Amino acid sequence: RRVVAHMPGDIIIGALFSVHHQPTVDKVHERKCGAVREQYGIQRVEAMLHTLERINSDPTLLPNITLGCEIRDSCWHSAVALEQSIEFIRDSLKPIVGVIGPGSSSVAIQVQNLLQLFNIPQIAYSATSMDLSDKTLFKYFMRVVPSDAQQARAMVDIVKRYNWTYVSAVHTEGNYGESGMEAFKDMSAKEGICIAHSYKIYSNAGEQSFDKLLKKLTSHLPKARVVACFCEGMTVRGLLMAMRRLGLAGEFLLLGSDGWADRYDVTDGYQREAVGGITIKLQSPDVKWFDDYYLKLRPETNLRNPWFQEFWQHRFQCRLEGFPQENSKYNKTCNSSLTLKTHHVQDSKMGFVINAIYSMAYGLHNMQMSLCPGYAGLCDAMKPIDGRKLLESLMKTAFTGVSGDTILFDENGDSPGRYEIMNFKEMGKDYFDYINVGSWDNGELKMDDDEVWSKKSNIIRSVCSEPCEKGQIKVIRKGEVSCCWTCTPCKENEYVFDEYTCKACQLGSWPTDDLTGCDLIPVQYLRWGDPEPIAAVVFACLGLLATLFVTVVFIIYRDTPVVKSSSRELCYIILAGICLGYLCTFCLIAKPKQIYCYLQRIGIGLSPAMSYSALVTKTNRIARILAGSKKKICTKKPRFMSACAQLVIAFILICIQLGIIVALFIMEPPDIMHDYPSIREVYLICNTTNLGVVAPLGYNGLLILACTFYAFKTRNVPANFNEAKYIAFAMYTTCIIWLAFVPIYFGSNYKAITMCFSVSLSATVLLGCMFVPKVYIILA
Amino acid sequence: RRVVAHMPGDIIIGALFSVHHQPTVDKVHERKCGAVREQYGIQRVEAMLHTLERINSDPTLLPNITLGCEIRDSCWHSAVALEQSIEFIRDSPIVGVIGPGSSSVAIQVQNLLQLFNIPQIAYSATSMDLSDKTLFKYFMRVVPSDAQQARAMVDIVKRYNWTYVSAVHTEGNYGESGMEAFKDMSAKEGICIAHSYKIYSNAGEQSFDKLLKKLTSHLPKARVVACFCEGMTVRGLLMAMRRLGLAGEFLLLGSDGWADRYDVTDGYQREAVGGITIKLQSPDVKWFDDYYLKLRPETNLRNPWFQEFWQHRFQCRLEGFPQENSKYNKTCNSSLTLKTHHVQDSKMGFVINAIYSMAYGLHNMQMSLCPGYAGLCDAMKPIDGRKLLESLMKTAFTGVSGDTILFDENGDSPGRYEIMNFKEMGKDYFDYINVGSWDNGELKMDDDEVWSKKSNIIRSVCSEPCEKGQIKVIRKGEVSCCWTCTPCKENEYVFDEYTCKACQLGSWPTDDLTGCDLIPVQYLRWGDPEPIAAVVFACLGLLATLFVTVVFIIYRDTPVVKSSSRELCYIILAGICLGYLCTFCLIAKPKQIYCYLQRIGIGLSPAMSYSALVTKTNRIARILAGSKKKICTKKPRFMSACAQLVIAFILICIQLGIIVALFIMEPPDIMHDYPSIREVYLICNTTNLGVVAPLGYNGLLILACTFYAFKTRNVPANFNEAKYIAFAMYTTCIIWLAFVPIYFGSNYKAITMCFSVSLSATVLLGCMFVPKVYIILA
Ligand SMILES: *[C@@H]1O[C@H](CO)[C@@H](O)[C@H](O)[C@H]1NC(C)=O
Ligand SMILES: *[C@@H]1O[C@H](CO)[C@@H](O)[C@H](O)[C@H]1NC(C)=O
Ligand SMILES: N[C@@H](Cn1oc(=O)[nH]c1=O)C(=O)O
Ligand SMILES: N[C@@H](Cn1oc(=O)[nH]c1=O)C(=O)O
């Protein structure tokens, strides 16, 4: 059958050490475990035996009690451990007070469901899953190693510290890996990370599984350099063997969780590729006295340990003819000169085994005096020993570990602990080692970043998209995970608000340089410069001087018959109208202000009114004089209107236009409004509407029609130096100009300026072609 | 400690069958169950014993080899799971084990089974999670999954349209999985589960009382209790029912466990009535009953509990045996047997059928391994149920109930339930009566036998439907169970049971709020109340105009009427007559031909019928223009002659131009106006802006002729025809102007327009034309 190591004693404590290897996938119903594991196996078994010798040899710790122990392998498998636990239970009814936990996590769960029923305590020295920390489904489980809830924090801390946010996660099958991922993935997706794709694999999978798993892990090759391997010991060995088989040459930075640890086993022989691997590991101080004891142990005196012979056969690949287990498959023989100090390595999680054994011993020590303090040993109270009373003693007991740190069990049945962020490098020529490169204690991630990455060119940040935050280029989500954001620019008026909002700045403002904020775009207008404004004001000045000259002539020459014959006051009216029309641009272009904003309307409307009204009335009177004299039969109506009625009718014809202007001014208050052709530019002009300008325009258009009709009715008339012979052309010109005005004004983009030119043309065509003629007549 | 009735044999097969009642609350750690299960334990142990002896004594099943057995009393629960595992873990011989009573009592056993490959067939477990073979590989059963039970429960609660239910349940894998399935597959369809109270089977009086008081909190709302209540839970709830003395005010509804059993209802004759109770179909086994009746305490000693079982059954004592139990005062005489008050347990045939299932699987393995030898050859020396379970996977054979046994992939024998109740046959003897049968999704109950009156139990309904015509249901914030039903808008029809939408302008929702409809418009046509006198007025105006036209054209030769003009008068006649034409053309159903005709009329009619008057007044003023001054006035020509016709035509062309312009702007078409949500009509596209322009031009052309006629007023004309034309024309203008209020002041903006046109016509005729007729009369 299967060999079982035992230690005689009144009280026997169980133990499940992964003495052999995990049974090969080929066939497990035969329960054929694989090879013998040294570090996880024989060292742990000898630790058990030797520490039990120390305990039962210690007078102060469990006096007069020889704690025997039954040691059973477990081959690190769901299968063999269950059968061994069954053999524990069948003999429970010599009794077995408690067992020392199995190696992995899933095996711990499976043994725990069995052993919680029968009040048999268990102490696991390596199981590191959250699910076992629950005290409802696994109410009766205890361990001396902190949960992985304090390890997923370590990984999130590392992956945050080095800016990575796009990584690929491989977790070994079983409860340990699945729980570890369901911790790390959630805890990083919450904080700052987005996992590429969380794979899975079996520890003992075939070479094809790794040969394809490397293909998936290189699928994201230029974006996933951080293999978040939450993996057991053998799985990382599998990926490394795959790297060697396929030829990956260090293109990865592994992150080995716990099962990798500083264990040389996983990478020995082929440690040429794991370089850069950042591997967490529980803080396990070394033990020296046991190390010397084990080193000086030889097969000749080792009989209480049954696996020692084949272990000696394995490590030194030879034969021991002095023992029945000759292992004839080997050719060479083993000599006594060989000693264990040659290439000796001590497993990482070794002090935890002794810590667990000490915890069990101290629980028994507490329970002894919890009932019969006087008696030294197993009194009548504990003859039917009850694990119920031992459970609370374990809950409350707190010894001092061999390393030194005090051990306490919380309500969850675990113990606090720290970590150690080791790392793998290349020191010598073909010589590699696990340098301590940091530490971890309740979030205080300390890492000697200087020791590794001897340059500043560290590993690629492994982010899907570079920090695309340059300038106005903004990041937007691709409709998927935030690893690969879609990065796009914003438009000229579209201002990046905080980090991604491509909002558009308001119509009045402009997004400033470097997309820092919105600035109100400076306004532009016509102050005094530019070619056309100064040209128009010079035009106005010339017209003003000419008009002043003509008015002076006709006021200092009011007696001569060449001009006194025509209505002197009507000429005075037209002169004043032309003067104000010229003056309109003198205030139309200066600067748009509240005060001038209505003077502009005053000019543009009022001026043409009397500029043409006196002309219309004069031409109507002339027509009536001539048309009535065409027949001249009687025509005995000397007065008609005549007299001074011309001045009053001009007053009233001014008054109507004044009223129209007042009505517009009241209905449309004069004030400056900001205008803009496009968003690129902003202007400022008066608030006069599309209706404001044209409100007094018809009153003058019809008046122009009336005067041109009466000029037609006169046309060629023998008068005082034939004024009408030029007034006709003047009216033709003013008609065509005022007709061409509307198309030019509407849709001009230069509405404010063309008013002055239109008024200037209307003024000059009238003045020159109806007043100037008589001026050189004054010369004669 | 626990006593075991060991039966030796060549092949010993294990099993897990309860004997006494469930463990007491304070005796859990003592590992000692309490009172005796009279109808369960002895029945099941005698069942295994008798079927085993009949199987081994029959060469047709496992020939030349005897069959042994070994069990450990479990008393239900996982409390004695310690003892069942103590027996189990023996192993390596074990070739067969049979699943214990409760599902959770067997699930961990199955988990352990999956490791070292021992077969196990259940008979009372029902949980669906056990049907999964991924993690429960070596588990089997001869009863179906609880999914069928849940489906049956949903079917029962929905057939009698119970919706708002208050659902207690038991605990373990039965209650939790059963309630998850029942809730998921019930509340989806129509069911309103109030809550799912949880309670252990052996609970105390206080917990049962508080649970009952929570259940009695919805008395007019949920009068059923959708128990997954186990037998013990029903026991306790009925204890509470009696101690409080509930009047059965809510109708119980048990589950798989509670069954027809007299086990827990007794003493409470009138209470728990109406207990619809799903029970598993199993005919009573024949050869078990007589063999059980043959058992006597002195004759049979191999069964340990059997000796004191008589003292437990009959209130007496056995002096002749060490199991005295002196607590009983009376003594047992030689006049007692098991025939009196006998009851056979319902869940009986499943045990025997499962035992036969495993025996036939073992026989199949026996033939398959070494056909040469019938018995135990060298092949069975390596005891291994791994191949045995694979052999029995496909095994099929007839069951003792006349049916067969087949193990599907899920490993449950197909079956069916019964839906049977509790009623009141006669005074002081109240008995259940099998009143239904459910089968694989095909349902059937004798709804008549249940509720053998008109009165039923109050429907498990939170609120009445209250869908009377329009009152529409709506939620409150809780689950879709209780509705504050409310009617929608009068113009809104119920889109569905909880949605409404307003009808379009065409109409309002029809009767019963079934949907929407279309109102038959309605409009103004020939007939009607008001137009009774309208075309009468129009025809009287026609009579007047025809009379005046015939008298004028018959007296046209005399220059009496030729004093001023001839063509202008004819234009007046034409205009007034066509205005009457307008008032005919209106007040009808508007169509495409009518639409533009309306515009043409109410446009050019007053236009020309007043423009001719304008020109005539112009002519008379021009005649009297020079009379006042008469200085020379040697311009008698001007235009005159026939140029008055030209001036009239050029004057009237503007109105036609504007009319055609608005005709282009507004095409002649008929639209459905909406004066009110209730009613609609049909009318042209004419608007205020459409009508005001021709009316404006006609005002422009009426003002001038008013002014010119007033300038004329009293003149020495032919009989001074101008005396009355202006006198009535002032009224003409005042009525035309004062019309705008009435037109834009009521919904009658066609009949008023017609009356306006008719009046504005008749006033011109009666003044400008009536006197001249009397003139040419004499
Ligand atoms: C990356 O992480 C390190 C850690 O301090 C630090 O440089 C910084 O916070 C992150 N960003 C860059 C650009 O380094
Ligand atoms: C609903 O319940 C009433 C109550 O008497 C019953 O008559 C009817 O058959 C049930 N089913 C339907 C579909 O109405
Ligand atoms: N990480 C594992 C333990 N463990 O896995 C290995 O591969 N070695 C080792 O110690 C767990 O805590 O479940
Ligand atoms: N009550 C259980 C079923 N059940 O009750 C028993 O007593 N045995 C049994 O299988 C349920 O509601 O599902």
From Swiss-Prot, chain A:
UniProt entry keywords in alphabetical sequence: Cell membrane, Disulfide bond, G-protein coupled receptor, Glycoprotein, Membrane, Methylation, Phosphoprotein, Receptor, Signal, Transducer, Transmembrane, Transmembrane helix
Topology within the bilayer: Multi-pass membrane protein
GO biological process terms, semicolon-separated: cellular response to amyloid-beta; chemical synaptic transmission; cognition; desensitization of G protein-coupled receptor signaling pathway; G protein-coupled glutamate receptor signaling pathway; learning; learning or memory; locomotory behavior
The protein's name: Metabotropic glutamate receptor 5
S-S bonds: C33-C75, C194-C483, C229-C231, C318-C334, C372-C379, C464-C484, C468-C487, C490-C502, C505-C518, C597-C686
Similarity comment: family membership: Belongs to the G-protein coupled receptor 3 family.
Residue positions with a glycan: N64, N163, N331, N335, A398, N687
Biological function: G-protein coupled receptor for glutamate. Ligand binding causes a conformation change that triggers signaling via guanine nucleotide-binding proteins (G proteins) and modulates the activity of down-stream effectors. Signaling activates a phosphatidylinositol-calcium second messenger system and generates a calcium-activated chloride current. Plays an important role in the regulation of synaptic plasticity and the modulation of the neural network activity.
Upper classification of the organism: Eukaryota, Metazoa, Chordata, Craniata, Vertebrata
Record-annotated membrane-spanning stretches: 534-556, 567-589, 598-620, 647-667, 691-712, 726-748, 752-773
GO molecular function: A2A adenosine receptor binding; adenylate cyclase inhibiting G protein-coupled glutamate receptor activity; G protein-coupled receptor activity; G protein-coupled receptor activity involved in regulation of postsynaptic membrane potential; glutamate receptor activity; identical protein binding; neurotransmitter receptor activity involved in regulation of postsynaptic cytosolic calcium ion concentration; protein tyrosine kinase activator activity
Organism: Homo sapiens (Human)
Resulting phenotype, K618A: Increased constitutive signaling activity
Extracellular side: 1-533, 590-597, 668-690, 749-751
Subunit structure: The PPXXF motif binds HOMER1, HOMER2 and HOMER3. Interacts with SIAH1, RYR1, RYR2, ITPR1, SHANK1, SHANK3 and TAMALIN. Interacts with NCDN. Isoform 2 interacts with NECAB2. Interacts with CAMK2A.
Outcome reported for the amino acid change (mutating S566 to A/K): Increased constitutive signaling activity
GO cellular-component term (any): dendritic shaft
Positions in the Cytoplasmic compartment: 557-566, 621-646, 713-725
Cellular location(s): Cell membrane
